């Protein structure tokens, strides 16, 4: 199973940065809207 173990780390890190970056991309447009 050792050859399919980086995918869990991917889901742990890529999505962690994904939620932050979508928050940022939404916040910039929110300030634009204001």
Partner 1 sequence: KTRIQEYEKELEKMRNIIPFDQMTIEDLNEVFPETKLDKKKYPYWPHRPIET
Positions in the binding site for partner 1 (CB under 8 A): 17, 20-21, 24, 27-28, 31-32, 34
Angle 12-8-23 from CA coordinates, rounded to 5°: 25
For residues 3 and 10, which CB has a smaller minimum distance to partner 1 in the complex? Answer: 10
Nearest distance from C-beta of residue 1 to partner 1, angstroms: 28
Closer by beta carbon to partner 1, 4 or else 23: 23
Measured distance CA(17)–CA(11) in Å, rounded: 10
Name every residue whose Cβ is closer than 8 Å to that of residue 31 and which is 6 or more positions away in sequence. none
Query: Which residue, 11 or 20, has its beta carbon nearer to partner 1?
Result: 20
């Amino acid at each position: 199973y050792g050859a399919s173990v980086g995918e869990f780390a991917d889901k742990l890190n890529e999505q962690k940065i994904a939620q932050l970056e979508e928050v940022k991309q939404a916040s910039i447009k929110q300030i634009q809207d204001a």
